[PDB]
């Protein structure tokens, strides 16, 4: 089990920008064995670059790759949006044929703070028997960002799930949405909720909260 | 167009079976190797076994002990996998991938196919409008939203105003729940065309055939 390992695990590129990842292997491999993928989002992984420096069918002249033994690389010239995806290196020089962690290429931008927006349970999910309390935090850069539930003073840290987007297609930003499920009663037996976000865009906090 | 073809999604109960099909245009699956590759829900990717059509020989990565079985006919140009005694850790995404069939280019994998092992039932999505609590204030622009919870099996159709809307909506990634999936929607529109132009969120589920609309008011 010849095991490879990928860094970084995720990176920032602006566009135009020079970027460049490694791969080092457990043991040596022959180059020739050694070769990159690139996936997006919802399709399959697609051979980017084979036998360590060598570019498939399609893949632009900006990306390259080099090494021997157990220390690899791939580089892009000039970083362009549609570079943004997650690489995998891998060996199939010996069996178990062997994959990297991958390394996932993101579109750096400037920072943007959050636009927060809470939503109480509807009379409609309540008289179903239950209550969701839940709170977006759209358009936003870094991804770097953490929420908290504040039922009544008393920070509820159970029962919340939370959900990210990729980064988005246009404007290159995040966003996320956490739902704070509490019961029938629990709900209207408090009357204090809040959805609280920091983000590295400011120092003071963003609230938001309703009552009853 | 030389092309790797799979079977479709498969939904099993844990401790059952399955087996997956790989069907090869393009090439004779004789002259390669076949191989099948597993990627588990926002995770990486793992080699399963290799098999050379023309003697049959197969190499297993360990891990896969006697779960996994590969096999191939040459006379359908087919590949497959054998999956047994399924559990969770085993839903996926499964690749078949050949290795180049010819000077001159690169390996070839399938689409993918999808692989839920889940002992729940088909439960219908539950829809709720998401819109801001009696007062307002934003100006300009206002953001409403729809939770689709307690819903199985993957996936639900969630847009708003029949694509009407296609800016501005940020439909988050569903979770599991206790064997239940749960997902919300949000969308923003100038405050101009609301409220007095209906903004409608549409979630349909494919597995129990329900479409509902809800109206935010
Ligand atoms: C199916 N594969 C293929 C590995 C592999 C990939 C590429 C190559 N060779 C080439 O891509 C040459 C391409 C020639 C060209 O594009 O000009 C050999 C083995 C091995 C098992 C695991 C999944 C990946």
């Known amino acids: 089990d010849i095991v490879l390992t990928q860094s970084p695990a995720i990176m920032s590129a602006s566009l135009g920008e020079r970027v460049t990842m490694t791969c080092t292997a457990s043991?040596?491999?022959?180059?020739?064995?050694l070769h990159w993928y690139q996936q997006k989002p919802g399709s399959s992984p697609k051979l980017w670059i084979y036998?360590?420096?060598n570019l498939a069918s399609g893949v632009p002249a900006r990306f390259s790759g080099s090494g021997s033994g157990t220390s690899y690389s791939l580089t892009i010239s000039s970083m362009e949006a549609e570079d943004a995806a997650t690489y995998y290196c891998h060996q199939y020089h010996r069996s178990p044929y062997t994959f990297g962690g991958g390394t996932k290429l993101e579109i750096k931008r400037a920072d943007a703070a959050p636009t927060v927006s809470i939503f109480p349970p509807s009379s409609e999910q309540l008289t179903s028997g239950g209550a969701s309390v839940v709170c977006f935090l759209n358009n936003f850069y870094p991804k770097d960002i953490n929420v908290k539930w504040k039922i009544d003073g008393s920070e509820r840290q159970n029962g919340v799930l939370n959900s990210w987007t990729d980064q988005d297609s246009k404007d290159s930003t995040y966003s996320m949405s956490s739902t704070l499920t509490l019961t029938k009663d629990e709900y209207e037996r408090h009357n204090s909720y809040t959805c609280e976000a920091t983000h590295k865009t400011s120092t003071s906090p963003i609230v938001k909260s309703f009552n009853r | 167009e030389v092309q790797l073809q799979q079977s479709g999604a498969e939904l099993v109960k844990p401790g059952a079976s399955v087996k997956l099909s790989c069907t090869a245009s393009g090439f004779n699956i004789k002259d390669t190797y076949m191989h099948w590759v597993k990627q588990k829900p926002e995770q990486g990717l793992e080699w399963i076994a290799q098999?050379?059509?023309?003697?049959?020989?197969?190499k297993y990565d360990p891990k896969f002990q006697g779960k996994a079985t590969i096999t191939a006919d040459t006379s359908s140009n087919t590949a497959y996998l054998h999956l047994s005694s399924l559990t969770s850790e085993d839903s996926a995404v499964y690749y078949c991938?050949?290795?180049?069939?010819?000077?001159?280019?690169?390996?070839?994998w399938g689409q993918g196919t999808t692989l839920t092992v889940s002992s729940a039932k088909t439960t219908p999505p539950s829809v709720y409008p998401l819109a801001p609590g009696s007062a307002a204030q934003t100006n300009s622009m206002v953001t409403l939203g729809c939770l689709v919870k307690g819903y199985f099996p993957e996936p639900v159709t969630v847009t708003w105003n029949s694509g009407s809307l296609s800016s501005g909506v940020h439909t988050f990634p569903a979770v599991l729940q206790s064997d239940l999936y749960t997902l919300s929607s949000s969308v923003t529109v100038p405050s101009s065309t609301w409220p007095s132009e209906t903004v409608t969120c549409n979630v349909a589920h494919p597995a129990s055939s329900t479409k509902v609309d809800k109206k935010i008011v």
């Open positions: 098999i050379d059509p023309a003697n049959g020989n197969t």
């Open positions: 043991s040596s491999v022959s180059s020739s064995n």
């Open positions: 991938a050949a290795d180049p069939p010819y000077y001159g280019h690169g390996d070839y």
């Open positions: 036998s360590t420096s």
